[PDB]
Amino acid sequence: VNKTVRDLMPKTIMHLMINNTKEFIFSELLANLYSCGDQNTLMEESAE
Amino acid sequence: QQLTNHIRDTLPGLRNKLQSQLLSIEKEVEEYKNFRPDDPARKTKALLQ
Numbered sequence A: 001v002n003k004t005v006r007d008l009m010p011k012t013i014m015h016l017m018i019n020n021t022k023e024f025i026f027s028e029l030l031a032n033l034y035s036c037g038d039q040n041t042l043m044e045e046s047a048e
Numbered sequence B: 001q002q003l004t005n006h007i008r009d010t011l012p013g014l015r016n017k018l019q020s021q022l023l024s025i026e027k028e029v030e031e032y033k034n035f036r037p038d039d040p041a042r043k044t045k046a047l048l049q
Helices: A002-027 A029-034 B011-033 B040-048
Strands: none
Touching: A002 A029, A029 B040
16 A cells, blocks of 8 residues: 555646646746736836 | 436436537637637737747
8 A cells, every 4th residue: 555655646746736737837827917907017117 | 208218327428428528618619709800919819829
C-alpha cells in the first residue's frame, strides 16, 4: 500500500494542480486580462 | 406504452453520449452565441491570441 500512495500522490498533483495551472497561463490568462474593463486604467504607465 | 417502457434503464447510455458531445462544444459556442459582424474587441483579442 505504501508504494502505491507514494507513487500516485505526486502524479495526482501534477495532473490537477500544476498542469491545469500551466494550461491556464498559456491558454486563458491573456483573454481574462483583456476582458477586464477600462483597459486604459489597466495599462497606465508608472510616472517614473 | 410497450415501446416506451422498453427503453427505460437504457436511456442513461444515451444521456451520457449526448452530455459528452455538449461538453466538447459548449466551451466553443460561447463565442458564437454573442457573435456580431462588428466587434473590435473580439477581433483584437483574436489577433493577440
